[PDB]
Amino acid sequence: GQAQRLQTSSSVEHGQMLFKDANLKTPSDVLNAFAKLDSKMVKSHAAELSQLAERAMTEVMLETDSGKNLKALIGDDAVKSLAVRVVKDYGGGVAAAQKNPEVRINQMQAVFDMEVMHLKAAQRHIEGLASTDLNQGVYAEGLPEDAFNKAGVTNNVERAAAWIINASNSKGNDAENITSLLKEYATNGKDLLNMDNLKELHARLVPNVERDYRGPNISGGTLPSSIGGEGMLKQHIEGFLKENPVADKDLGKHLFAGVIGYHGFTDGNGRMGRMLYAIAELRNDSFNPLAMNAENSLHGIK
């Protein structure tokens, strides 16, 4: 039955079962079979055929050169999630599987290639910071106390809170939450180089942010897809910053650059980036507020 077929390990066994064809050996073979289906069969099994087309298109896409390029950048889970959404958006469902799957597969490789280009453009800038002097020039430029700390507090945790609060134009209860979270992560020993930990912080810092999918920009824009940007942030902190360790006094900068520069969240990137910078600073017994020039140099967004 359909329920049995859905639990197969891939579209190949699923197709073999549904199409009663043991000669189907690849996901391309499965897609090529769609043109051969009689019209009544296509109507009576429309729901399952939509699932199977999506599974087979996804599998084909993950083995393309661009699919492997994305895998290299953001890893298996993230590329699979992305591949499914692109197939849903561009794959054309059962009707396109019947009529012209190769056209769809080609179009989706162009979508993936655009995404790869955009992630790599951010990556050149962000990983480039590991070879720049972040203590001179703009990378060093600071903010006058009076711009964010009118009250004139001296304790570094309160100064960092004021800086974050001012940058987010945060008020009342929202500002109190920023302050509480900062104190909490300054002292809780939680590993920042862990995307799960960052998503938990983000959820409390930016409550009821909307989590909606944003796909690759193929219109001229360079914004990463939502999945792509989150995958790059994850690989940045769990991979790049571990293989190429940075100095404690520079970690905040690299976290700030990574979050905002890769667009690691659907919203509240600025708040997260500043919160991670401040936490890194405080754990290094310091707090140096960033000049706007320095923020712009770090995240590289224009």
Swiss-Prot record:
Which reactions appear under catalytic activity for this entry? L-tyrosyl-[protein] + ATP = O-(5'-adenylyl)-L-tyrosyl-[protein] + diphosphate; L-threonyl-[protein] + ATP = 3-O-(5'-adenylyl)-L-threonyl-[protein] + diphosphate
Q: Name one GO cellular component term.
A: extracellular region
The organism's superkingdom is given as Bacteria
Mutation effect (residue 269 to A)? Abolishes adenylyltransferase activity
Q: What class of enzyme is it?
A: transferase
Cellular localization per UniProt: Secreted
The parts of the chain that form a coiled coil are: none
Listed A to Z, the keywords are: ATP-binding, Nucleotide-binding, Nucleotidyltransferase, Secreted, Transferase, Virulence
UniProt-recorded Gene Ontology molecular function terms: AMPylase activity; ATP binding; small GTPase binding
Gene knockout outcome: Abolishes the ability to inhibit host Rho family GTPases and cause cytoskeletal disruption.
Record note on domains: The fido domain mediates the adenylyltransferase activity.
Q: What is this protein called?
A: Protein adenylyltransferase VopS
Parent sequence residues shown: 86 to 387 of 387
